[PDB]
Write a protein that binds this ligand. Structure first.
Ligand SMILES: [Mg+2]
Ligand SMILES: [Mg+2]
Ligand SMILES: [Mg+2]
Ligand SMILES: [Mg+2]
Ligand SMILES: [Mg+2]
Ligand SMILES: [Mg+2]
Ligand SMILES: [Mg+2]
Ligand SMILES: [Mg+2]
Ligand SMILES: [Mg+2]
Ligand SMILES: [Mg+2]
Ligand SMILES: [Mg+2]
Lengths: 169, 292, 159, 204
RNA sequence: UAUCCGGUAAAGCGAAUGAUUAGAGGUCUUGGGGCCGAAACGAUCUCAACCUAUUCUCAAACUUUAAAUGGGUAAGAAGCC
RNA sequence: GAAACCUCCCGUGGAGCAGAAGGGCAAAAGCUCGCUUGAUCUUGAUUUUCAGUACGAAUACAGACCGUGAAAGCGGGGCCU
RNA sequence: GUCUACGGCCAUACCACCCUGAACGCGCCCGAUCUCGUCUGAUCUCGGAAGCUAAGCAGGGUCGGGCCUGGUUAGUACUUGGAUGGGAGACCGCCUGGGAAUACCGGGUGCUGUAGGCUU
């Protein structure tokens, strides 16, 4: 009989790190835009790495943060391609989880020889009512303690909500 | 495991930030520029029209700063407004206007400049400001303390500021962030501004919801539907309130007495209680372990 | 031969004390100096506009001018053989009221009280101060118990 | 090779540690500041013989090491290979200098010759713990070790338990109290203060 | 007699910075070498760095502390009311 | 993959602030944007080196003409040396 | 008793975890038509008032860390002035006045200004 300790999805994060720049990245930005229904953001590199073939302030990745119902919907699709399995290590100690998909057309998108097959990266910021405290301007705070989502608590939310297994190893 | 970031050491070397900086209240960078006088002005005050919008309220205070703790010459709250006419939407831009206006009038009534400096009456919305009359006591002048509010176009603080300006305080300002001013053109309507001052932005939303879906309107404007505040009633309501403020701004409080004087709180546990309490935990551990 | 630089050797002087860095708390700014206020100068690291020179830190002097956010302040600086009363324009943040004078004003006020009264009475009262006189004749009662004997203690080597 | 010990004896200069500024310093002769059964428990060695200094003088790293070998050799030969623990309690930190002559006294400032310990009057140089059997064997060990140092140093047997800061008269009771708790060569003094959960680990 | 100024002596390093000894504890890390292992955070040691309490010993160009001696002012008619 | 991008947590500054080092600095003095030319015109006063001359460097004002900000303000080069 | 708004001094006010919060507040909270701003109504801006003290916030708790303040350390370390004092030196003792700092052990754990609530 808890009032608002209702573990919800605060946001869903999606990022395609092509690590190229130019055209490949502009191509991958269309994929997220088709998926999420909003323009994404290009992130640039921190610093040059001659190994990976990247340069400082060169656009490496594209990403986006989905919120609300659309984030619930896209999360659902992403678990369907993963078949509602995660692991213990897929959850972070902070009570967030995430998982890859190897190819976006699995979610439900049409391939093109140009706009190819960008594998991508789901990550779910779980939260509660009254987490905003941390990130507002004026009278800020820290979210107590018996209110912070545990790893265990986030696993059981997944185990209930999306009927998942959380396989061991 | 990792290196403990917050050691003895960490706390020994640690410096707190000021109390109100911790509480997330006082921008001391801005406070210094706002509040201190030029030393050659000496003890002449430096007033500021503080305006803060709470989740359910708008406060308007005039204050100068002394060393004991900035003194408040006058105040007006949005929750007073029921007296004057405003039943609902007390955090809205129109309410902000009333609340500011009321502060000016109440302030002016103290100094006897109620008859001099009527200020703007008809509410155009355009650039207005008070010229001090010669052979008469000059116009009161303070400055707007926005606080931590993101000072954008249409911010409710500037709703209050507009009010106190029309009320007859000379507070300097531009019209670059009254609601009306256009970013991609750079002119000011001052009929858009009037609408906002009169609550027509709210009335139209009320009319838009009722047209589309009854239930959402019923949900959105529940206290507006109770008290029977309708879209077509709205403009009149705020104009009545403006007049009533303008005719009597004086605050009378309530004669508070008949207090039982009882402790809701929990007082501080005395040394000796604390001293025994460990004594009992020490015993209780010993007697407990001498069994299994 | 040492460098003539303005700030040479103020590593410690202009350095906010331990756990008193950051915002210059506001009383400092908002307290009023008139003409002829006795004022002790004490440079500060946070505010670098209007800093006094390292020679006038510690030194007390009188205010002569007061601008918008600073105070002209005559202070006496010795130079080999000659003391030069000279006038410096310190920004408020590096300056306090020197209490040195207030204890004097307290005493003169107390004298004016004790001069007005004791005039109608007739009994004249000691207005001048007097240094601590020798400590008067008095008895000491070794009440019952006798004195406690103190033998010096025998040496031993600890370390 | 190096200068006589004569020439670097009195604590004349300011202390000049190996640092950013003083660099290219040759490594100290002495390195291993303790030897014998150092992996021993407080209980199984309470004697604490010290060689205390009685001159505000500088001791060479060279002379420390030599004194350390001298004492340990005798301790081994006397009682046994694992029957003591010796602690040297002066590390050569001060860097000593050397203006060398093939210009004259122009631009004379030394290169780092070597390191040195500065030792105050009443400061301990070496210290030894072993058994109540073995008092005399330590004394002579420190006695022999004196001859490697310049100046003058008393040999003294402290009123502490082992290399602890606690007076040996009260050491055993304190353990019975659990004021004190064995902790390798040392002993952790527990006080009242800390949360009661620490107190519940003891008494259980 | 009031009142400011100070960062030297000393002291400190279970307080920062840098130095530095030892054992307790720790698969934190991970390794490189082993021994018993096909191999296994399996067992057993080990030495690397890191960390949890302790511990040895230091600083002209480090310091939480912090003297003595020391430098300002002030102690009235150019003042009070 | 030890290093690419994203996300949550801790983080008294252990980063950064053109350069030596010292000081100073966290809803900044750091970073990122928006608008800019106060690095403009003009009297004296003062500080620092000092002989208490110059130079340079700086501090407080004052008068103009601007900038920016809702405003209080800040700005006549570079946080200070 | 206690809160809100603006505060002064800035840890006796910080951090950690634990418990309790009547009324009024303060919040979280529900929305994006308009103002405003985002990749994203998360923040920011704006319009609300169905829920709830879970969190923030307050008050308390902990043989808590930390900070503050006493003791001890110690008349010890240091030190002004003195001697045709000692000592081969290094250094030390006395006279004359001044006099610290850890470890260790106690106690304390925000005070308060202006304006306005609530407990009628
Ligand atoms: Mg501001
Ligand atoms: Mg020879
Ligand atoms: Mg020398
Ligand atoms: Mg110095
Ligand atoms: Mg020293
Ligand atoms: Mg700059
Ligand atoms: Mg000007
Ligand atoms: Mg929202
Ligand atoms: Mg709560
Ligand atoms: Mg609660
Ligand atoms: Mg405590």
């Amino acid at each position: 009989e808890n009032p608002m300790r209702e573990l919800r999805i605060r946001k869903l994060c999606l990022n395609i790190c092509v690590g190229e720049s130019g055209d490949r990245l502009t191509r991958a930005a269309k994929v997220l835009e088709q998926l999420t229904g909003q323009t994404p953001v290009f992130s640039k590199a921190r610093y040059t790495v001659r190994s990976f073939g990247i340069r400082r302030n060169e656009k490496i990745a594209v990403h986006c943060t989905v919120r609300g119902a659309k984030a619930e919907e896209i999360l659902e699709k992403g678990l369907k391609v993963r078949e509602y399995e995660l692991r213990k290590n897929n959850f972070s100690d902070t009570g967030n989880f995430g998982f890859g998909i190897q190819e976006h057309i699995d979610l439900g998108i049409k391939y093109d020889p140009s706009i190819g097959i960008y594998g991508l990266d789901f990550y779910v910021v779980l939260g509660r009512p009254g987490f905003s405290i941390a990130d507002k301007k004026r009278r800020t705070g820290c979210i107590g303690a018996k209110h912070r989502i545990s790893k265990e608590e986030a696993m059981r939310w997944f185990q209930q909500k999306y009927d998942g297994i959380i396989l061991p190893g | 495991f990792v290196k403990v970031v917050k050691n003895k050491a960490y706390f020994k070397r640690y410096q707190v930030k000021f109390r109100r900086r911790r509480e997330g209240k006082t921008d001391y960078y801005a406070r210094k520029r706002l509040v201190i006088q030029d030393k050659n002005k000496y003890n002449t005050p430096k007033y500021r029209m503080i305006v803060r919008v709470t989740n359910r309220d708008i406060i308007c205070q005039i204050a100068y700063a002394r060393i004991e703790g900035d003194m408040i010459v006058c105040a007006a709250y949005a929750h007073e407004l029921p007296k004057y006419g405003v039943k609902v939407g007390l955090t809205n831009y129109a309410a902000a206007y009333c609340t500011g206006l009321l502060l000016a009038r109440r302030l002016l009534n103290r100094f006897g400049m109620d008859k001099i400096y009527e200020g703007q009456v008809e509410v155009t919305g355009d650039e207005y400001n008070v010229e001090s009359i010669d052979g008469q006591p000059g116009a009161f002048t303070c400055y707007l303390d926005a606080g931590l509010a993101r000072t954008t176009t249409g911010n409710k603080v500037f709703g209050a500021l507009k009010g106190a300006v029309d009320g007859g305080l000379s507070i300097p300002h531009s019209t670059k962030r009254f609601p009306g001013y256009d970013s991609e053109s750079k002119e000011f309507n001052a009929e858009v501004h009037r609408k906002h001052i009169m609550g027509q932005n709210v009335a139209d939303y009320m009319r838009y919801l009722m047209e589309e879906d009854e239930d959402a309107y019923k949900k959105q404007f529940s206290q507006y539907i109770k008290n029977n505040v309708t879209p077509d009633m709205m403009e009149e309501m705020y104009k009545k309130a403006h007049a009533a403020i303008r005719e009597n701004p004086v605050y009378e409080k309530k004669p508070k007495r008949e207090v039982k004087k009882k402790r809701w709180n929990r007082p501080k546990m005395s040394l000796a209680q604390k001293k025994d309490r460990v004594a009992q935990k020490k015993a209780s551990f010993l007697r407990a372990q001498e069994r299994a | 031969t040492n460098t003539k630089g303005k700030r040479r050797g103020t590593r410690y002087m202009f350095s906010r004390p331990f756990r008193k860095h950051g915002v210059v708390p506001l009383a400092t700014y908002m307290r009023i100096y008139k003409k002829g206020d006795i004022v002790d100068i004490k440079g500060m690291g946070t505010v670098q506009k209007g800093m006094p020179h390292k020679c006038y830190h510690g030194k007390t002097g009188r205010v002569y001018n007061v601008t918008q956010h600073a105070v002209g302040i005559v202070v006496n600086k010795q130079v080999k053989g000659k003391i030069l009363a000279k006038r410096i324009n310190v920004r408020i943040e590096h300056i306090k009221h020197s209490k040195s004078r207030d204890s004097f004003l307290k005493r003169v006020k107390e004298n004016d009280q004790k001069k007005k009264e004791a005039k109608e009475k007739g009994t004249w009262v000691q207005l001048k101060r007097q240094p601590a006189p020798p400590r008067e004749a008095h008895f000491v009662r070794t009440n019952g118990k006798e004195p406690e004997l103190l033998e010096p203690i025998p040496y031993e080597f600890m370390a | 090779g190096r200068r006589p010990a004569r020439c670097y004896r009195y604590c004349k200069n300011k202390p000049y540690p190996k640092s950013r500024f003083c660099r290219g310093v040759p490594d100290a002769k002495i390195r291993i500041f303790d030897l014998g059964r150092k992996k021993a428990k407080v209980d199984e060695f309470p004697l604490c013989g010290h060689m205390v200094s009685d001159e505000y003088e500088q001791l060479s790293s060279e002379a420390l090491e030599a004194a350390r070998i001298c004492a340990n050799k005798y301790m081994v030969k006397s009682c046994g290979k694992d029957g003591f623990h010796i602690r040297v309690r002066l590390h050569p930190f001060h860097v000593i200098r050397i203006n060398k002559m093939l210009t004259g006294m122009r631009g004379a400032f030394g290169k780092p010759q070597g390191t040195v310990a500065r030792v105050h009057i009443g400061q301990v140089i070496m210290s030894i713990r072993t058994k109540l059997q073995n008092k005399e064997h330590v004394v002579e060990a420190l006695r022999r070790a004196k001859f490697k140092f310049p100046g003058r140093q008393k040999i003294h047997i402290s009123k502490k338990w082992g290399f602890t800061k606690f007076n040996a008269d009260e050491f055993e009771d304190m353990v019975a109290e659990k004021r004190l708790i064995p902790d390798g060569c040392g002993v952790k003094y527990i006080p009242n203060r800390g949360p009661l959960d620490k107190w519940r680990a003891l008494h259980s």
